[PDB]
Design a protein around this ligand. Structure first.
Ligand SMILES: C[C@@H](NC(=O)c1cc(C(=O)N[C@@H](Cc2ccccc2)[C@@H](O)Cn2cccn2)cc(N(C)S(C)(=O)=O)c1)c1ccc(F)cc1
Ligand SMILES: [Cl-]
Length: 374
């Protein structure tokens, strides 16, 4: 097919509990399934038995492992782990045709980090060194890949929800999207931080000051399931989504992610729930564009003749997190060489015969440089 064909369809996800790619570490080779996380910057692998791991990295069998004689601990919003730093050879067999010596944290203990049944045994933090632990001197995997090889400084993700998808490393594959790509600047290289300049629920502007949508940051994060919104924005958005979906009433806990609602298999009334649009700053002064997701992205299946769903927009106290809810609508291009992130409608996103996810523009939006937090 296109020149990156052998990286298409290189991601899997088991019951929707994270998308992961196979990575092969050490010598002789040990291949493990690695969750792709654009919200963090450590490459870390299970390296000791755990009840939720089928396999783990055995350093003593790899002749090329080098111990860096330093511990590392990483806490996330969900979960934490502790382990030991070293370096070893790493290749991605359905990724670029190169092998690099990368830092690797060997996870030896953890709390609420591994997910039973998820089939992944480590994490690949693809964001930048500023947020790596123990500190920014520990080079992240993608930085090593670009410094040691010819691979261009860009990767792109198509996360296909319900689970699989593609991680194209070093380019873009045009089969994975339709329409045009539209780009927003990476505001700052730490997380993949972006600026959200307007939010609409079924065409209706939420009308908050744009500084509320980015307080205290907005990031794109493939290792977080939900669209997470700061408190005032979440409360406002729920009020508006309730109002829009008012031909059916749901208990208050459903909008808090505490109750599920189930429909008989195949009857979910998608049409009653609104589309949600986020407008992002564009590449030209005063220009923006909008990405629009469907309830097939923000109502997530929980795995009888019953389709059960959880509402997967939730409250955050650390800014807007555009997680898998947002990314499953779109092919997302992390164009680190041009400090920008591109969105296009994904060729695999879940939709129905009446509505599809969309990426549209340009719009005119003034004073966008004021939306960001300082
Ligand atoms: C793998 C699974 N992920 C979740 O279940 C999940 C993970 C986190 C979280 O902290 N993610 C960490 C990395 C990590 C990866 C794996 C385990 C723990 C943590 C970094 O990305 C952000 N981070 C950096 C510093 C602080 N935080 C938060 C939440 N929520 C808080 S939620 C419920 O979505 O609002 C839910 C998944 C399932 C389906 C998918 F399509 C995609 C992902
Ligand atoms: Cl097209």
């Amino acid at each position: 097919r296109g020149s990156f064909v052998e990286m298409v369809d290189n991601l899997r996800g088991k019951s929707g509990q994270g998308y992961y790619v196979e990575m092969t570490v050490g010598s002789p080779p040990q291949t493990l399934n690695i969750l792709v996380d654009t919200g963090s910057s450590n490459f870390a692998v299970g390296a000791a038995p755990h009840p939720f791991l089928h396999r783990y990295y055995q350093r003593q069998l790899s002749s090329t492992y080098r111990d860096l004689r330093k511990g590392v601990y990483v806490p996330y919003t969900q979960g934490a782990w502790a382990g030991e730093l070293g370096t070893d050879l790493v290749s991605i067999p359905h990724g670029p045709n190169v092998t690099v010596r990368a830092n690797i944290a060997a996870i030896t203990e953890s709390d609420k980090f591994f997910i039973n049944g998820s089939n992944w045994e480590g994490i690949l933090g693809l964001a930048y060194a500023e947020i790596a632990r123990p500190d920014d001197s520990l080079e992240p995997f993608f930085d090593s890949l670009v410094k040691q090889t010819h691979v261009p400084n860009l990767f792109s993700l198509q996360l296909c929800g319900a689970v699989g998808g593609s991680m194209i490393i070093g380019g873009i594959d045009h089969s994975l999207y339709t329409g045009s790509l539209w780009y927003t600047p990476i505001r700052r290289e730490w997380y993949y931080e972006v600026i959200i300049v307007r939010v609409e629920i079924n065409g209706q502007d939420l009308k908050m000051d744009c500084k509320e949508y980015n307080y205290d940051k907005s990031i794109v994060d493939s290792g977080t399931t939900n669209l997470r919104l700061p408190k005032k924005v979440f409360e406002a958005a729920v009020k508006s989504i309730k109002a829009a979906s008012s031909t059916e009433k749901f208990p208050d806990g459903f909008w808090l992610g505490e109750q599920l609602v189930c429909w008989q298999a195949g009857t979910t009334p998608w049409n009653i729930f609104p589309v949600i649009s986020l407008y992002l700053m564009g590449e030209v002064t005063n220009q923006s564009f909008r990405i629009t997701i469907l309830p097939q992205q923000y109502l997530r299946p929980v795995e009888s003749q019953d389709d059960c769903y959880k509402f997967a927009i939730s409250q955050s106290s650390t800014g807007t997190v555009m997680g898998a809810v947002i990314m499953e609508g779109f092919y997302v291009v992390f164009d680190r060489a041009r400090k920008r992130i591109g969105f296009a409608v994904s060729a695999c996103h879940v939709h129905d015969e009446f509505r599809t996810a969309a990426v549209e523009g340009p719009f005119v939006t003034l004073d966008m440089e004021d939306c960001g937090y300082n």
